Write a protein that binds this DNA or RNA. Structure first.
Length: 67
RNA sequence: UUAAAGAGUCAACCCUUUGCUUAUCUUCCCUAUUUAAAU
């Protein structure tokens, strides 16, 4: 996700969602088969972001109590 | 218990034409008999 999903297309015309999900280069980079230069930068983007506004909330039984 | 919430509304010509048609052997055969008073 990026604001307005603008980005910049390649010379043939591709975005990251198409590039990383074409022929499984995501696992080829996450493992580190392309080096440790494209491995730290990609892992830097994997950060959590909490937001609960306008989401369903349901009670589930967990032994003695609820969650 | 993916809990809680929400107006789909409005309008319309389906019209026109038409040759179904010719022929034909259903044949042979046969034991229905046996009683009893009107309530």
């Amino acid at each position: 996700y990026t604001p307005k999903s603008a980005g910049i297309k390649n010379e043939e015309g591709e975005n990251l969602w198409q590039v990383l999900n074409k022929a499984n280069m995501f696992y080829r980079i996450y493992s580190g088969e392309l080096g440790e230069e494209l491995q730290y930068l990609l892992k830097s983007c994997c950060t959590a972001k909490e937001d609960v506004t306008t989401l369903p909330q349901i009670y589930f039984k967990n032994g003695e109590g609820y969650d």
